[PDB]
Amino acid sequence: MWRLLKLSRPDLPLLVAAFFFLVLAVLGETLIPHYSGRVIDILGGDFDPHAFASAIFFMCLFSFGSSLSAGCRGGCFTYTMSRINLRIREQLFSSLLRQDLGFFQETKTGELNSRLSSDTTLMSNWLPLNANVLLRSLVKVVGLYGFMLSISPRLTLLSLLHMPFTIAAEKVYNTRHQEVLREIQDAVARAGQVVREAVGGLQTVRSFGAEEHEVCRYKEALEQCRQLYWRRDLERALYLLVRRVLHLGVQMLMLSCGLQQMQDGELTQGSLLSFMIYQESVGSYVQTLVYIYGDMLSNVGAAEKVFSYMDRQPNLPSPGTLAPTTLQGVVKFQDVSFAYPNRPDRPVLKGLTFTLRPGEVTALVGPNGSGKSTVAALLQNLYQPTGGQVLLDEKPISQYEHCYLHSQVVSVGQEPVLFSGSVRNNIAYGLQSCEDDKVMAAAQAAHADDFIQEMEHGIYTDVGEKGSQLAAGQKQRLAIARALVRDPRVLILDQATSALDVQCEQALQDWNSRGDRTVLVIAHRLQTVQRAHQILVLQEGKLQ
């Protein structure tokens, strides 16, 4: 493929070195047999000790050189393959991170991980084995066709018959092989998703006692994969058998033609006999060449999913350059309506219009499914409204630079998500540099410093995967501290006090002590919504 070559372009010098070493190895291998035959003749009667040693020495020299060249070639090819694999992995992972949030609802994390882990090796393993066989077979064919010019009319007869017979069936075989490879990869990804889900939610599965059910599901997926593998292997075996039959038929035809020519005085018995060995080698070499070419094409074509992911354009507006040195923090919704892209024709918000001002606290309340978290997501520029505008300081929210925008507008999620690592890495997450005193001050502001000291390593204690080694209230306090580190101008609190006890909840009620930031509070406990300057009631996606 054109794209794979342009991707492997940074590896050109190593490929050139490998090609040079392969040429040298072929050169040595093409002359070893002459001295081997000289040794065999010298031993076979009329022994001469002097000429024996010379032939042995020449054989040793050529074998040594060819072996060294072959080893260098193999090393170069292996390194090239590994480098290409790593480059593909890096580019695919970098491209996945830029996609819109709707992309990750359609796909599954286990299947994406399977694409990263399995499809890339299939892409990369096309270099080592195929190139050497290709070059060796091409050299052998070119050399052997020249020797056979002893009978020119038979060669034209030959090139017209033996060569184009194999073209017809390989067109069908390559299509079938490519289809079966694509199906195999899809089945492998589906099987991997089962392990992903079962291991990720182990505690729930154990609490419901459903381990054997997951084992059965995985075994069914494995059975599907095994059936696809068997189909591929059987088809390959049939193709090889048909090739052997065709080769035998072609061999019989020229044996007949050559015997007919010999009786007519065209050539002697010696010339005819030497012609058949070249015939037998040439047919096999041509068949191997075509088979390797078809295999390369099919293996390259079987991995279109990775290529499609690596070039997909996300459904997002063009990046924004705005980064004012000063920001007021006025947020305006102007007739905003929204429907989730994965399920349109089902509106969630319908013509919302409100204003948030600095120095004031606004409360947004409503039943379950009203659309409060959707409003929070729209405010953070995670989704685009289908109608209306969202403005920050009288300019569209999408026109601000990404890092600046998410440095100035910060939120606390409904169910906070932590990452594996230390406490001081989850706090100040996404910040290039942060001093220890800022981290400690933010932890004190979130009332999280009391339980941090009780841990064995302080702020360097390892938080488990997804924060699984903490209590829920402690995780929520860490999320609050993570939000408060960046002292943002606009702060969003989506059910930020659901898991906290009443004593800690009432202490954090002063979200605007400084009075220089815009605060939006989403809650179900009306006690916390009593002190808000402005109250917005949301019912079925409409204000009232």
Binding site: L24, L27, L31, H34, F62, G65, L68, C72
Partner: peptide, 25 residues
């Protein structure tokens, strides 16, 4: 001898160079 003598010494030089580089590495 089917191979010419110049090619033989050329391959001798190649093998010597490969051994020298392998020892130098």
């Amino acid at each position: 001898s089917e191979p010419p003598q110049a090619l033989v010494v050329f391959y001798v030089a190649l093998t010597a160079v490969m051994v020298a580089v392998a020892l130098y590495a």
